[PDB]
Paper text:
The apo structure forms a similar dimer to that seen in the R3 structure (in this case with the dimeric symmetry axis corresponding to the crystallographic two fold axis parallel to the unit cell b axis). In the apo crystals, the two fold axis is crystallographic. The apo structure is locally less ordered than the substrate bound structures, lacking density for residues 97–100 and for four residues at the C-terminus compared to the + NAG structure, which just misses one residue at the C-terminus. Otherwise, the apo form of the pseudo monomer superposes well onto the + NAG structure with an RMSD of 1.15 Å over 135 CA atoms for the pseudo monomer. The domain swapped dimers superimpose less well with the RMSD for the apo dimer vs + NAG of 2.81 Å over 241 CA atoms as a consequence of flexibility in the positioning of the pseudo monomers within the dimer. The NZ of K178 in the apo structure forms hydrogen bonds to both the main chain and side chain carbonyls of N173, whereas in the liganded structures this side chain is pointing in to solvent. The region 176–178 lies away from the sugar binding site, so the change is not a direct result of ligand binding. However the other end of the third helix lies quite close to the ligand binding site and the loop that becomes ordered on ligand binding, so the difference in domain position may be propagated from sugar binding.
Author numbering:
A (entry chain A), B (entry chain A): 73 to 96, 101 to 214
């Protein structure tokens, strides 16, 4: 894999705060959907389109981003300032495939009856004794 | 945090293959957008809606899923069979916030000129000497 095939430490290194983003009054069929600042469409490929602060990484900058891939600075955003990098992903499934835990043990707290209603799910979410943990999830 | 507040190993444990999914001929304003098999809308909260094979985890099953949270089996899918769990996330940004690496060193391979075109990005993606690595990314 790329992380090991090349000797990246021979290149200048910079630290960033990394986030993820995807495309999308625009819908996936519209001609302007997915267009980056630079004019190219978002792309995940050998060279993927990423967003940066152009005063730190100019448009056209090529970066190697470990466990993501080569990135080309193609996009910007008003919230993308300083040593900030927004990594493009096509879908939620793709980002979990690349960073989430696939092999997972889970615990069975209560077996279902076969049905659940909005009222029942709300009453679970409102559980008085668990509200201290809810802030994290909601 | 929940992972440590309760003694989960006192509950039955099962292994799954975990993936991520999100909502969405439907668009976010449509009344039927985001509806799960069970009839409830997808939700990320103290109790989040997840998808399973109902012959393994019936609808209404409550699971504790480490580093995700409590899940209620609310959804199904033709591809969700066996010991398979699909974890709901609202957005790509959320799944990277929860599983991606935020504190990241990146390497500067080439500084940009300020512009990049579709043709130029394509020529990068077509780089003959790097095609062996491309299968992974595309």
């Amino acid at each position: 894999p790329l992380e090991e095939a090349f000797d990246w430490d021979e290149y200048p290194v910079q630290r960033v705060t990394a986030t993820g983003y995807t495309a999308g009054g625009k819908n996936p069929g519209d001609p302007l959907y997915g267009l980056t600042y630079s004019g190219v469409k978002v792309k995940r490929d050998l060279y993927s389109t990423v967003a940066a602060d152009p005063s730190v990484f100019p448009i056209g900058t090529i970066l190697f981003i470990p466990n993501y891939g080569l990135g080309v600075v193609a996009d910007t955003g008003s919230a993308i300032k300083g040593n900030r990098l927004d990594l493009y992903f096509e879908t939620v499934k793709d980002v979990y495939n690349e960073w989430g835990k696939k092999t997972l043990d889970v615990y069975v707290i209560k077996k279902g009856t076969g049905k659940i209603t909005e009222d029942e799910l709300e009453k679970l979410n409102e559980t008085k004794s668990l509200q201290v943990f809810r802030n994290q999830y909601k």
